[PDB]
Amino acid sequence: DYHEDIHTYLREMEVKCKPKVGYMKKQPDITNSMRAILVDWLVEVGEEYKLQNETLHLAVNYIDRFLSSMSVLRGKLQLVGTAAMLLASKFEEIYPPEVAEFVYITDDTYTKKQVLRMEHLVLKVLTFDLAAPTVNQFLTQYFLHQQPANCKVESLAMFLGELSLIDADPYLKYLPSVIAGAAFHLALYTVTGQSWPESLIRKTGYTLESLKPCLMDLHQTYLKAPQHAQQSIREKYKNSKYHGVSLLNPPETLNL
């Protein structure tokens, strides 16, 4: 159903929509850890308002692109994240939370006027280019290649793709299609012992060899997940909605 056309188009757009890999080094006042805290909070916001995973992925794309060009003081990072989540929700959700809900969830750190002004600024800086490819949009296509469909594989891949959002180092250097490739293989391997399928080599041009760097990073993230300072994704993926996949044991080795 236009599946090939759309995949090709997203592969073009993800390159165009990619944040600057090196931006955090060039931010005077904010760090990767502060960004980790922000994204983990957004996961919680997403859970609170029962937002789509897609909405979360979009907001993080908006933040990283915004921070790729705009210097932001630590006390304003949450305002940037908040406006990004409001925009993502308006773009993606059937029923986005009201602006007042977004004001409320900062616990009155910021005013409605500040959130709305930031919304406008984020739109200006991104030149209204909000239809960005996400790890989620690629995963969802890759799932169509399962034989047969496995709910644990799907949810676990989504979980792993979500973990990548937390840590700009290293995941900012990988494209959404590649993170998704690594997440799907790692999930499929964890659950069923199967590997990145031949049909996806044909679709994407990616092999286990080309996915290896991302895979090694993601495997480490997966193994270390229970010890990460940020736990909101692990907690979220305990839910039956995601078939409790965060309780699955990560494979000790990948044998690649």
Binding site: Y2, H3, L10, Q52, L116, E119, F128, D129
Partner: protein, 297 residues
């Protein structure tokens, strides 16, 4: 690149999904434009956010061109290429002549091109109706008013239920399917194809049930044969009258064999079997297609 300073307002055109559209002229280049004004509450409306983001990606001869976005803190102005008329008004103006078949064929061909482009760029229009299809004096027709549009995913998840103007709304939406996709836009275009030929709406219902029943009386009440899964759809009722399907030659009598074939594929009940815009471009109906100027204005 623009500023409101170089635009001279000419006249109000109308109100679509949101905002208001004015005809204007760039004083410096002479370009005539359509200006969509948005008063800025809840901040920038989701309809604006979607229309702008998606139209910036959708550059195509049969999609209205968004030229610029002029942003004040109180006002948002969308600068669009100007087209001369809408399809509804043109059909009204053709009351006594009819629309020449070469022009109907050309317009459908162009609409399908424009639509295939949207769908290949993961965009659903969701409000295809003659009022939103704009024509110029050179023979072009273009998709406009992307206020109800959205970026979709592969495969789709559940999107907004309250979509498409009733007369053009697909049976899968009317019956409450959890999933709808690109087939909804084809349904609308199929209704519009028929309307260009008869100059009256194919299915002018005044409620959702009336709409469904008008569709059933024309295409037959769908069973599990024609549309596997119909009977388990959320808003299907076993009490629906079971109308026999009519001879398609009677649905749009001036249409000849090829035209009828195409229309029937655009109005297939099962969204899976309903023809894609991409596939429809190669339909034998279009073997002699050209792009003549409108016969009026």
């Amino acid at each position: 690149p623009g500023s409101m300073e170089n635009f001279q307002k000419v006249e109000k055109i109308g109100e679509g999904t949101y905002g208001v559209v004015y005809k204007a002229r760039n004083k410096l280049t002479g370009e005539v434009v359509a200006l969509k004004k948005i008063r800025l509450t809840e901040g920038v409306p989701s309809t604006a956010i979607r229309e702008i983001s998606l139209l910036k990606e959708l550059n195509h001869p049969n999609i209205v061109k968004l030229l610029d976005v002029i942003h004040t803190e109180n006002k948002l102005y969308l600068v669009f290429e100007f087209l001369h008329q809408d399809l509804k008004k043109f059909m009204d103006a053709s009351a006594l002549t009819g629309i020449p078949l070469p022009l109907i064929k050309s317009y459908l061909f162009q609409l399908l091109q424009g639509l295939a482009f949207c769908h290949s760029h993961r965009v659903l229009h969701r409000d295809l109706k003659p009022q939103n299809l704009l024509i110029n004096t050179e023979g072009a027709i273009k998709l406009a008013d992307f206020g109800l549009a959205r970026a979709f995913g592969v495969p789709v998840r559940t999107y907004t239920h309250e979509v498409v103007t009733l007369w053009y709304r697909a049976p899968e939406i009317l019956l409450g399917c959890k999933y709808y996709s690109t087939a909804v836009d084809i349904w609308s275009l199929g209704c519009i194809f028929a309307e260009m030929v008869t100059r009256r709406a194919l299915f002018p219902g005044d409620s959702e049930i009336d709409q469904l029943f008008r569709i059933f009386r024309t295409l037959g009440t769908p069973d599990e044969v024609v549309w596997p899964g119909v009977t388990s759809m959320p808003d299907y009722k076993p009490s629906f009258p079971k109308w026999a399907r009519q001879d398609f030659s009677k649905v749009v009598p001036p249409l000849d064999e090829d035209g009828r074939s195409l229309l029937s594929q655009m109005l297939h009940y099962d969204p899976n079997k309903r023809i894609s815009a991409k596939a429809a471009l190669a339909h034998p109906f279009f073997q002699d297609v050209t792009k003549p100027v409108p016969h009026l204005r």
